[PDB]
Structures are given as structure tokens and as C-alpha cells.
Design a protein around this ligand. Sequence first.
Ligand SMILES: *[C@@H]1O[C@H](CO)[C@@H](O[C@@H]2O[C@H](CO)[C@@H](O)[C@H](O)[C@H]2NC(C)=O)[C@H](O)[C@H]1NC(C)=O
Ligand SMILES: *[C@@H]1O[C@H](CO)[C@@H](O[C@@H]2O[C@H](CO)[C@@H](O)[C@H](O)[C@H]2NC(C)=O)[C@H](O)[C@H]1NC(C)=O
Ligand SMILES: *[C@@H]1O[C@H](CO)[C@@H](O[C@@H]2O[C@H](CO)[C@@H](O)[C@H](O)[C@H]2NC(C)=O)[C@H](O)[C@H]1NC(C)=O
Ligand SMILES: *[C@@H]1O[C@H](CO)[C@@H](O[C@@H]2O[C@H](CO)[C@@H](O)[C@H](O)[C@H]2NC(C)=O)[C@H](O)[C@H]1NC(C)=O
Ligand SMILES: *[C@@H]1O[C@H](CO)[C@@H](O[C@@H]2O[C@H](CO)[C@@H](O)[C@H](O)[C@H]2NC(C)=O)[C@H](O)[C@H]1NC(C)=O
Ligand SMILES: *[C@@H]1O[C@H](CO)[C@@H](O)[C@H](O)[C@H]1NC(C)=O
Ligand SMILES: *[C@@H]1O[C@H](CO)[C@@H](O)[C@H](O)[C@H]1NC(C)=O
Ligand SMILES: *[C@@H]1O[C@H](CO)[C@@H](O)[C@H](O)[C@H]1NC(C)=O
Ligand SMILES: *[C@@H]1O[C@H](CO)[C@@H](O)[C@H](O)[C@H]1NC(C)=O
Ligand SMILES: *[C@@H]1O[C@H](CO)[C@@H](O)[C@H](O)[C@H]1NC(C)=O
Ligand SMILES: *[C@@H]1O[C@H](CO)[C@@H](O)[C@H](O)[C@H]1NC(C)=O
Ligand SMILES: *[C@@H]1O[C@H](CO)[C@@H](O)[C@H](O)[C@H]1NC(C)=O
Ligand SMILES: *[C@@H]1O[C@H](CO)[C@@H](O)[C@H](O)[C@H]1NC(C)=O
Ligand SMILES: *[C@@H]1O[C@H](CO)[C@@H](O)[C@H](O)[C@H]1NC(C)=O
Ligand SMILES: *[C@@H]1O[C@H](CO)[C@@H](O)[C@H](O)[C@H]1NC(C)=O
Ligand SMILES: *[C@@H]1O[C@H](CO)[C@@H](O)[C@H](O)[C@H]1NC(C)=O
Ligand SMILES: *[C@@H]1O[C@H](CO)[C@@H](O)[C@H](O)[C@H]1NC(C)=O
Lengths: 211, 384, 420, 148
Amino acid sequence: AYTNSFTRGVYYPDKVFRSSVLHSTQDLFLPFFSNVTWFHAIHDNPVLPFNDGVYFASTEKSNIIRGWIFGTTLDSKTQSLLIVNNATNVVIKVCEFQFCNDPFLGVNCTFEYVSFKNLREFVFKNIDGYFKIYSKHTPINLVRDLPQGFSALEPLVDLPIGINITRFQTLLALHAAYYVGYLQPRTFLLKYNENGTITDAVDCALDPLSE
Amino acid sequence: TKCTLKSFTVEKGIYQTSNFRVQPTESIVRFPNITNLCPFGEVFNATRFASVYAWNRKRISNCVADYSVLYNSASFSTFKCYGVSPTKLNDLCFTNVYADSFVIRGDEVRQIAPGQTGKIADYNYKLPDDFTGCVIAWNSNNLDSKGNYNYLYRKPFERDIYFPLQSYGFQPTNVGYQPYRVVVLSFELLHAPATVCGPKKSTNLVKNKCVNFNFNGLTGTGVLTESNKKFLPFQQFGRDIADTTDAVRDPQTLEILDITPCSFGGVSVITPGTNTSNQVAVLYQGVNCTEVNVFQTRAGCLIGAEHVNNSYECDIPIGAGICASYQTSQSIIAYTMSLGAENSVAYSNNSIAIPTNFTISVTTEILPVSMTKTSVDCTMYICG
Amino acid sequence: YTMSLGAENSVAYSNNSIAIPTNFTISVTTEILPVSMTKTSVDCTMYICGDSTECSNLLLQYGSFCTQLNRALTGIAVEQDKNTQEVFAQVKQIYKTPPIKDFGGFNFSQILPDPSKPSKRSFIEDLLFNKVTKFNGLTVLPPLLTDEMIAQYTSALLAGTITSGWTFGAGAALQIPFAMQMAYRFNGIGVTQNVLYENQKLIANQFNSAIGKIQDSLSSTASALGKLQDVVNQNAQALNTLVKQLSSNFGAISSVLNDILSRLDKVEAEVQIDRLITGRLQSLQTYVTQQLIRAAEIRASANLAATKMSECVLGQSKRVDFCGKGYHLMSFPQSAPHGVVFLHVTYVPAQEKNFTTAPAICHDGKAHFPREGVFVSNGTHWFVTQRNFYEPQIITTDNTFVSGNCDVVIGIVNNTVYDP
Amino acid sequence: SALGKLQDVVNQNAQALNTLVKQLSSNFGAISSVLNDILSRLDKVEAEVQIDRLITGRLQSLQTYVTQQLIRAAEIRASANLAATKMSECVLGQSKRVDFCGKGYHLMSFPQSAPHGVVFLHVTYVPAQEKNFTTAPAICHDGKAHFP
Ligand SMILES: *[C@@H]1O[C@H](CO)[C@@H](O[C@@H]2O[C@H](CO)[C@@H](O)[C@H](O)[C@H]2NC(C)=O)[C@H](O)[C@H]1NC(C)=O
Ligand SMILES: *[C@@H]1O[C@H](CO)[C@@H](O[C@@H]2O[C@H](CO)[C@@H](O)[C@H](O)[C@H]2NC(C)=O)[C@H](O)[C@H]1NC(C)=O
Ligand SMILES: *[C@@H]1O[C@H](CO)[C@@H](O[C@@H]2O[C@H](CO)[C@@H](O)[C@H](O)[C@H]2NC(C)=O)[C@H](O)[C@H]1NC(C)=O
Ligand SMILES: *[C@@H]1O[C@H](CO)[C@@H](O[C@@H]2O[C@H](CO)[C@@H](O)[C@H](O)[C@H]2NC(C)=O)[C@H](O)[C@H]1NC(C)=O
Ligand SMILES: *[C@@H]1O[C@H](CO)[C@@H](O[C@@H]2O[C@H](CO)[C@@H](O)[C@H](O)[C@H]2NC(C)=O)[C@H](O)[C@H]1NC(C)=O
Ligand SMILES: *[C@@H]1O[C@H](CO)[C@@H](O)[C@H](O)[C@H]1NC(C)=O
Ligand SMILES: *[C@@H]1O[C@H](CO)[C@@H](O)[C@H](O)[C@H]1NC(C)=O
Ligand SMILES: *[C@@H]1O[C@H](CO)[C@@H](O)[C@H](O)[C@H]1NC(C)=O
Ligand SMILES: *[C@@H]1O[C@H](CO)[C@@H](O)[C@H](O)[C@H]1NC(C)=O
Ligand SMILES: *[C@@H]1O[C@H](CO)[C@@H](O)[C@H](O)[C@H]1NC(C)=O
Ligand SMILES: *[C@@H]1O[C@H](CO)[C@@H](O)[C@H](O)[C@H]1NC(C)=O
Ligand SMILES: *[C@@H]1O[C@H](CO)[C@@H](O)[C@H](O)[C@H]1NC(C)=O
Ligand SMILES: *[C@@H]1O[C@H](CO)[C@@H](O)[C@H](O)[C@H]1NC(C)=O
Ligand SMILES: *[C@@H]1O[C@H](CO)[C@@H](O)[C@H](O)[C@H]1NC(C)=O
Ligand SMILES: *[C@@H]1O[C@H](CO)[C@@H](O)[C@H](O)[C@H]1NC(C)=O
Ligand SMILES: *[C@@H]1O[C@H](CO)[C@@H](O)[C@H](O)[C@H]1NC(C)=O
Ligand SMILES: *[C@@H]1O[C@H](CO)[C@@H](O)[C@H](O)[C@H]1NC(C)=O
């Protein structure tokens, strides 16, 4: 299944304050009005391609989705980034795992690290071996699907792992609605208000008016 | 004014002779208040360096780095740096530093650079083409040769664990055939709060005064002030339209400082001709007199001219309705210009004025019509 | 679509037909002109090498580029004051209006000063001032004349124009009653002055209503100021371009010059800094070249505005379509940000009758010709009348002059001529 | 100081040439501004790097001068078209154009030559000694309104 991304998936491109200004930036972004693939883990945890980078989201009330796996082959022949959220902690490893036959959470580790009503949005990308993560949490007024309205994600993490990633998967809690979109290299014109905050954007390649 | 015009005679007028800038009173140094010494003395003494097919990366973080301990050492066969000069490493600072630590054949040290190529740099140690850091290496024949056959070889920072897997045979009798230990320091300037900085001490902070600041190795000069620029918690600096820094967060106390550049302006000199007087007045354009007879015009602080309460024709222009002249008791005066004598025309619905007489005036008007016909032989001008 | 050039009109010409306007409309047409632009100056050394000695010592190797750029911007900055002086300072004395405004029913209260204001602008000058809207070594110098001084000059020019006709331009101002000034201005367009005095209330009401429409036009339609607002926008766009070019790398490791001087030691750094100097200097030469060419366009507009002030405000113009559409009567100047606005007052003829006409009239052998105006017929009778307003008069030896006889002239007509 | 406009056009051109000549003394980042130093001190593969800096600088300096002279020549041409218009309307005619042909009502103008320019002696009638009078737009005779 599919749905329209609308204007979702904008994020602060760098750790720099700017205000009352329209800023042109080129980066991996989710294209405006692209189609996110959609999933329903009832009565749905496949391995996806990673492409250049991933936007990811879920619409929530019970927090079933709790992690991700990334790599080339995910089968102990090479290192593979595991990301887990476990009740309060975040736990991250790159070990040469052979994962479960059907990866879920029960209700050479060269790098390791530690730290519906809700929509939670994430972006993952790899550049020069730096795995970067951005996110946002928000309430939603529409229960059924992604809201046709604007908000932007902020950075949380950067992992200097150097590992090749071309595939990924997501992890579910057992004794669920989630979305995936692919980033592309796009020029975005970003509107910053008085308060350091991105309030609107133009994906310049979308249509001739956006150009 | 004479030196500006390249002349001993100066005509009556106003001349921009120089540009004034308020000088920084003192320097301000603001590094994070962190005190651990960095672990480089461990890295350069590690018991077993990695094979180059499987090179180790150590994250240096949360520490103070005296790079002189490395750079002064007699050990290193090379210390080449590609985005920084090694003399500056104690003054500059970083979010993290990554040490890539491994062993290679001495001939192959040539492959470790930005933009270089060859079988290591292709298969198992590609640097970024914009590599911002230093390659530190030395001959390790006496440490690592035996032969010894353990040292195996096969995008930027690609790790890739018949097939291409092979090892050097390091006997101590091997010179370019010998093992070399190499540590490549890659520096994370890419923005966040700094956590790897040189041993240079922080001063106290100063506000509301012109100072030569340095925050985490961002040097500059300006008037620092508390500000309503409400940074989001991840943001470390704010940038102007010019990409010059416009606000900062102090790394020891997380308040946001506006940076405004120190006051500056053109130094106009107002003069009657040298063929009249040697007295002059100075207009510091746009500058407030508290930042420099003295008189605040709307055009700038004016010095050496008397403000006069009358008004006259504009003899030498200044700006914003102010003009100046040299007048008797002789001195330069500055005054609001008179636009002309005021005249209530004697109008009423049945009065007319008719001239009973005339004057045949003659008024000269002068117009340029041509200018000196130059020609330049561009090859003789350029090449002689 | 293929554009249409205008409505299509076969004019009803024939060898004996003339159309004469039986009535007029006084029209007031606003013309807006740029006169100056913001007096910028850039300290080229602080733009290129801001607060670095290490960069400034390299910039001295480029010789007198920096000083001739500061000279070129200073030449532009001074000629903005010259332009502003030439447009407004055409009046030798600050004339001021009588206390009582007995201008024969004409009502200048919307264009004359209002003493209620903090700067003594008129009502229409306030609309114009409402509808029209950098630490990197950039600076803005003030104009030599404040907007209050420009409002004193537009007040003086206007108070002269109202109380004294053209006379305040040519010599000492002579008072003349405003109805009699307009009567001269009607003779100036070849309309016999009794056409004013017989219609003075109508002409005053047309003028007062036309001034009223200017306030509604300027209040509703901000795009009318487009010439002045574009001069502001072009200068802001040029400065924003000049400033954004500081952020460009030009092939150096970083455009922020303090990065180069903190990261690199002198013999490594000077190679990088010379790229920034070369790029920034070429960018500043580009800005100064654009400003010199733009300043020449503003000077052409200021010379035109000064010419309109001289010929159109201080006088009455015979130059067709120079002083707005229609036959010109008079113009009132109004100040605006970096410009001037003329309210050109003009006579437009408005209600035609077709008539039969003739070049001459045969009386007894003699061919009579009109002294001024044209011979015209309503079909049964022949009248002479002035060219620009239908006013039939009996044909007489006072209205006409003889020359030669009937045999010489093509299309002459027989009629009596009354000899008073 | 009456000749100020003509003396200024002479000064601007002399100032431009003296600037263009003095730029030959500038290094532009070469090891000397005297081209014979480079050619007497260096062999060609070394020298051509230095000479290319002088060529780039001197050529950019000459492009700047020619750009100034093109813009200045347009200013002088606009003044020459104004002077030609004054000759045509003001000398060869009499002008109704208020304040075009000197202050006052224009009678005639005499041209006189000057270095790089022209000077017009505009002869103008200026009215000079008022009397006040009571006035009227029209006069009643026997019922008829008479106008002048
Ligand atoms: C990341 O892994 C993929 C495989 O999942 C690599 O793709 C192969 O690259 C080789 C050349 O090195 C090609 O000959 C193969 O055809 C590719 N295989 C597939 C299935 O596409 C990729 O090169 C790796 N990238 C890095 C930087 O390690
Ligand atoms: C002159 O014309 C103006 C309008 O063009 C008249 O001004 C109005 O005057 C009345 C009071 O008489 C006020 O209530 C209005 O607010 C005024 N309008 C404006 C826009 O100012 C003025 O009355 C006229 N005066 C004469 C003598 O005709
Ligand atoms: C000349 O034209 C004007 C309009 O421009 C005529 O004046 C209008 O006349 C009507 C009645 O016919 C009145 O209701 C309007 O109020 C008048 N307007 C103005 C501005 O006063 C005028 O009557 C015409 N005169 C002739 C002789 O035809
Ligand atoms: C042409 O003009 C004349 C004069 O205005 C008109 O003749 C007068 O007409 C009125 C009636 O409309 C008579 O009372 C007068 O006695 C006539 N005077 C003369 C001198 O004859 C004439 O009617 C007009 N013709 C047309 C076709 O309009
Ligand atoms: C103007 O009137 C005269 C008579 O008053 C006309 O002259 C006569 O014209 C006819 C026809 O050509 C001749 O037969 C007569 O001999 C003419 N008489 C005289 C005294 O010349 C004349 O034709 C009329 N012209 C117009 C334009 O109507
Ligand atoms: C995108 O989704 C819309 C419905 O949201 C659908 O009509 C369209 O065919 C989809 N296109 C692609 C390329 O998935
Ligand atoms: C999360 O997992 C780690 C081990 O991976 C464990 O130490 C930690 O206590 C866990 N936290 C919670 C709240 O379960
Ligand atoms: C780590 O590498 C060794 C060989 O060096 C291998 O035997 C082991 O299986 C690897 N670890 C994992 C978790 O597979
Ligand atoms: C900016 O943020 C503050 C709270 O940080 C808020 O009160 C204010 O309304 C915001 N500005 C605008 C234009 O809403
Ligand atoms: C290696 O360790 C010794 C002490 O065991 C120390 O003196 C030396 O400085 C270290 N090497 C480096 C390069 O710092
Ligand atoms: C740094 O030191 C000051 C006292 O000198 C202390 O108040 C402040 O909390 C410290 N900041 C950090 C980031 O540790
Ligand atoms: C210059 O000085 C001389 C006397 O040295 C004097 O005669 C002359 O009038 C002066 N000129 C001006 C313009 O002041
Ligand atoms: C000039 O600076 C002083 C403080 O030094 C301030 O009180 C004054 O208001 C300033 N004047 C202007 C015109 O800004
Ligand atoms: C100027 O005049 C004002 C009153 O108009 C007076 O207060 C002030 O002291 C005078 N200043 C001088 C220097 O004469
Ligand atoms: C004048 O008369 C002609 C007769 O054909 C007519 O076409 C034309 O429209 C008329 N014009 C006016 C202004 O009455
Ligand atoms: C006007 O033209 C007609 C034919 O169209 C001709 O009969 C008549 O004589 C001409 N009249 C004049 C005055 O030319
Ligand atoms: C004309 O008469 C008035 C009477 O008040 C007087 O003010 C004015 O000065 C007189 N003007 C001349 C030129 O005599």
C-alpha cells in the first residue's frame, strides 16, 4: 500500500541558528508529495532497501515499534548496525550478528553506544561513514493517516561507524501502523521565522512554480 | 588629506581621508571547562596495531589535547597535515577527533593522502578528497618485523572485511619493504559543542565592550551582548547573510550572545583651501562621539567645528541639512543650511503686481562637450 | 493570445467636415520620477579583508584598485546630492502661501502643507511616503537635504505656482488672483479666456474632483509607485548580492577568512587568502560597475525631472505629451522617497459636434479668412469659432481678414460678412 | 571657479591616466612589478607563473580604466547632446522653454568656445520694479462683459 507524504520530512540541515530568512540548501530530503510505502503488522516487518537514505514514521498509541537493523546482508558475514529503544534506554551496536529468523522484541562489536494520538518521525542517512539521525514527535488531529500540514525534524545522533548499508528492517514488540519514504538529493528553500525555526519549505524540483 | 590627494595644495571641500575602527580593548578566550588529558600517548604505544584490511578507529572526545607531545617527537617519519597547520593545533578545536590506527609497508605510505590512488587506497583505506587532518607515521621494523605474516591487506572510510586477501612478509632484514605504524588523525570540525580542545586557558567573559573574542577556536572581534536569539538546544552558532558568525553560545555557560562588529566609519576632513587656512574639522561618519570642540551631527561625530545657531548658504556640505564654512575670530563653523530667504507673496483675490521696468541680465552657462582622446596600445602597456 | 494593439477607429475624415469639441474635461495625471538613490559607500579594505592585517598586507600588492573603488562610490554618492539639488532648488526664495485660501473655488488643501504633521508634508506627499518602503564595511550616508527640506522646497515651488503663475521662475514673484492665472493658462492653450470665467465653478469642481481621485488612486493602488519602489528594490538587491558574495569560497578552503587564519600558518594561508581577495575584489568591482551604470540612469531621470520642474512647474509647456496627456495648464510638484511626483493639470477636449467647414468665405469678390479659429456651419448658417471650444460668432470684418479673390482658393463658400 | 565643470573634466581624465600608469608599479602578487626583473632572474618554466600574475593584474587594471572611460564618455555625450540642443534652440532660435535658456525670459544666446567645452552667454529679460494694482477679470459696460 501507499500514501502521499505531503510536505512532511523537512529537517534542520546544519547545527546553525538562522532567523527571518529564506535559505537555499542542497541535501538528501524526502521529496514533497512523494509516496511513502505503508505497513500494518496485524492478522509486517519485511527487509527494505535503504537507497540513499530513509525517512521513517509511525502513528501510535501503544508503542509497538521499538527498533531498526541496517547493513548489506544482515547475516554475520559483515558488521550490521542494530538500533533498539528499550522502555527508557536507547541501545546501539554494530556486531557481526546472525539475527533472529523473524526479528521482534519480547515484552565483532567494533562500535557500541547507549543513551492513534502520536506521530513520531525519523530520518536516517549515511555520509562518509557517519550515520546521522534526526527526529520529531507530535500530536495528530487526523487519526487515520499522515497530516496534510507542516513540521520539521531536528538532529539527535551521529555514529562514526564507516559500515556499508544498502538494506534495513524494523523491530516490533510482542508477548501496527508505520510508513517509509526515500530521500533524494534536492535543493530545498527553507523559511526560518523570527524564532530560529523552520516554518515552511519549497522542494525546488517539484514543479515549475516551485522552481 | 594632503597624502590622500597626493598634493601639497588642498582645495576647499570635504575629503574622506581614512576609515576609523574602534579597537578591541582586550581578548576573550572561551573553551569548554573540561580537564581530562587526551589519550594520544596510549594510541602511539598500543600493543598491536591493526592490519590495514581491518584498521581500528578510536574516538578521542571529552579531553584537552597538547598536540606538541606528538609534533615535537623525534619518532615520526611523516607528520603531513592537509586542512590545518600542525603549529595551530593547540589553538584550534573540535567536536571529536578520530584516530585511524594501523600498519603498512613503508613504500605504501605514499597512498595515504586525500585524492591519492593505489590498491590500499582503493580497496581498504580511501581518505576523503577534502581530508581535514594529519597523517602521522614511522618505521616500526624493530617493533613489528620477526618473518611476520599477520599484517593483511585486501568510498571514504570504506571498511571491507583466488581472493584479494594477502599479507606482507616482514623480516627485520626487509628499507621501503619494512613495516610502518601509521595513525591518521581526522578532525571533526563539523558543528556541535566542542569536546576536544588544546591546552590554551579560557579568560572570563566580557559584555557591552569591543573585544578580540575566541569561542571554541572561532576567532573574531566585536561587542558581545546578551540576546533574545533563542537557539534550539542542538544549535551552537548563528550565521549572518555573509556566513560570518552573528551570535554564539558560550561553552562554559549556555547563554546566547549577540556579536555586533565594533563601531566604524569614514573620517572625512572638512577644510577651507590651504590657500586660506591650515585649520580643519573632522567628521567621523555614522560614529557616536562617545565612541571616539565636539558636536554630534546626524551624519556623525564632528570635531574642530563650532556649531552656530544661525543658518547660511551651504558652503561645504556635510549631511542631513548640516553644512560648514570658514568665517569670522576666524574658525570653521557648522550650521543647518538656509534654503533661502522666506517670502510671503502678497496674494489676494483682486490684487496684481505688474513690473514697471526690467533688467537685461546676461547669465553664463558652461557645458562639457568633449574630453581628452586617449588611446592605449594594450600590448605595450601590459608587456613593454 | 495574439495581443490587440488597441480599439480600431476609422476617423470620419472628408474634405469639408470638422469636429469641434463643445465641452472639456480638466484632467490631473500623476507622473512619478526617480531623482536619487541611497548614498551607499563601501570600505573596500574592510569588505575584502575585514579586521585582518594578514589579509590587508596582501591587498596592498593589488595597488590602487581599492582607493579608486572608494573614489567611484564617492562620486556616485555626491551626484545624488547634485541631482536632488537640481530638481528641487530651482526656487531662489522660500515662498509661502497667504493665510486665507481664496483661490476662486480651486482647492489645493490636499497638495499644500498640513501644519498638523511632524514634518510639514502635504496629504498627497504622505500617501507617497507611505506607499514606498551590512556591518561588512558597507555604510549608508545621509542625503544633504532632509525630507523636511525637500518638503520646504516643494512647498515653496507650489506656493509660488499658486500665488504668482510662472513669474516666480522668471523674476520676482508677482501676485495674481488664481482665476486670472488660469485665464492666462487658457490663452496659453489657445482657448479664449472668457471660456474660463464663464465656466469657473465647473472648472474648479472638475479640478477639485480630479485632485480627489489622486488620493483614491494612491491609497488603493500601491503599484502606481513602481518606478520609485523598483529603484529601492534594485539597490537593496545589489547590496544583498554584494554581501552574499562574502560567503562564496572562490576556490579557498573556507569563505570565513578567520577559518583560514586560525587553521593555516602564513605560507600555506596566503595561497588561500589570495583566492578570497581575488574573488571579493572582482565582486566589488562588479558592484561598483553596476552602481556607476545605475547612477547614470538615475542622473538621466533627475535631468528629466529638473527639466519638468523648470518647463512644466515654473512654466506652461507647449511640448505635446511632455507634461501629461492633453493640452498642458500647470503642474504641482510633490516630494516622494528618492524621487518627485508631478500632478500635471491638463485640458482635454471632450464632446464633439461634426460640422460642415470651409477654408475661406467669398463675400463680394473678396475671399475672407478667419483671424483665429475656423469657419463652421450648422447646415443653415455660417459662424467663425475658436479651434478648441465650440463658441459660434457671427462672421464679420473684425473676425476675418481679406486676401485676393474667389478664383484662387479651392473649396471657398459664398456667404455674407457683416461689417459692424 | 566659474570654469569648474570644464576643469573637472580635465582633472577626471588626468586622474584616471595617472592611476592607470601608477598601477604598472603594483606587484599583483608577482615577485617584482618590473617585468625585466622576472625575465632577468628566472628561467621560463618558473618565470611564466610570475608574468601571468602581472598580465592578469595589468589587464584587469586596463579593463577597469576602459570601463570608467566608457561610462564617463556617456556622461560627456549626454552633456554634448544638451549643448547641441542649446546651440540649436537657444542660439539659432529663441526659446519658450522656461529656465532652459538661462534664468528670466529668454531673448538670445551667444556661444563662446572653451577648452573641452562651450559657454553660452544667455541674454534674458528679467522684470524688476513692481507696482501693486487692483484688478478685475472682466468689465461691465452696457450689460456686456468686456475682456482684455
Ligand atoms: C556496499 O555493498 C554492496 C553490495 O550489497 C556493494 O555492491 C557491489 O559492488 C561491486 C563493486 O565493488 C559490484 O561489482 C557488485 O555488482 C555490487 N553488488 C550489487 C549486489 O550491487 C557496494 O559496492 C558496497 N559499497 C561500499 C562503499 O562498500
Ligand atoms: C477643500 O477640499 C477638501 C477635500 O479635498 C475639504 O476637506 C474636508 O473638509 C471637511 C470639513 O469641511 C472634513 O470633514 C473632511 O474630513 C475634509 N476631507 C479631507 C480629505 O481633508 C475642504 O473642506 C475643502 N475646503 C474648501 C474651502 O473648499
Ligand atoms: C460639460 O461637461 C460637464 C461634465 O464634465 C457637465 O457638468 C455636469 O453636468 C451634469 C448635468 O448635465 C451635472 O449633474 C454634473 O454634476 C456636472 N458635473 C460637474 C463636474 O459639474 C457640463 O454640464 C457640460 N457643459 C456643457 C455646456 O455641455
Ligand atoms: C443654425 O444657427 C442659427 C442661429 O443659432 C439658427 O437660427 C435661429 O433659429 C431659431 C430657432 O431655433 C430662430 O428663433 C432664430 O430666429 C434663428 N435665427 C436666425 C438668424 O435665423 C438655425 O436654426 C440653426 N440651424 C440648425 C439646422 O441648427
Ligand atoms: C458664389 O456666388 C457667385 C454669384 O454671387 C457665383 O458666380 C456665378 O456662377 C455661375 C455658375 O458658374 C456663373 O454663370 C455666373 O456668371 C457667376 N457670376 C459671377 C458674378 O461670377 C459663384 O459660382 C458662387 N460660388 C460658389 C462656390 O457657390
Ligand atoms: C501514489 O499514491 C496515490 C494515492 O495516494 C496513487 O494514486 C498513485 O498512483 C501513487 N503513485 C505511485 C508512483 O506510487
Ligand atoms: C535496556 O537494555 C540494556 C542492555 O542492552 C540494559 O542494561 C538496560 O537496563 C535496559 N533498560 C531498560 C529500561 O530495560
Ligand atoms: C568475529 O571474528 C572471528 C574471526 O576473527 C569470528 O570467528 C567470529 O564469529 C566473529 N564474531 C561474530 C559475532 O560472528
Ligand atoms: C516566538 O516564540 C515565543 C516562545 O518562545 C512565542 O511566545 C512567540 O509567539 C513566537 N513568535 C511568533 C511570531 O509567534
Ligand atoms: C609512549 O609511552 C612513553 C612512556 O611509556 C611516553 O614517554 C611517550 O611519550 C609515548 N609516545 C608518544 C608518541 O607520546
Ligand atoms: C563551567 O564552570 C562554571 C564555574 O566556573 C560552572 O558554573 C558551569 O556549570 C560549568 N559548565 C559546564 C558546561 O560544565
Ligand atoms: C590664494 O592666496 C593668494 C595670496 O597668497 C591670494 O591673492 C588669492 O586670492 C588666494 N586665492 C583664493 C582662491 O583664496
Ligand atoms: C551615544 O552613545 C551614548 C552611550 O555611550 C548614548 O547614551 C547616546 O544615546 C548615543 N547617542 C546616539 C545619538 O545614539
Ligand atoms: C541657540 O538658541 C536656543 C534658543 O533658540 C538656545 O536655547 C541655545 O542656548 C542657543 N545656543 C547657542 C550656542 O547660541
Ligand atoms: C460624424 O459624421 C459621420 C457621418 O458618417 C459619422 O460616421 C461620425 O460617427 C460622426 N462623428 C461624430 C463625432 O458625431
Ligand atoms: C469634396 O469631394 C467631393 C467628391 O467626394 C467633390 O465633389 C467636392 O467638390 C470636394 N470639395 C472640396 C472642398 O474639395
Ligand atoms: C503690495 O501691497 C501689500 C499690501 O499689504 C504689501 O504687503 C506688499 O508689500 C506690496 N508689494 C509691493 C511690490 O509693493
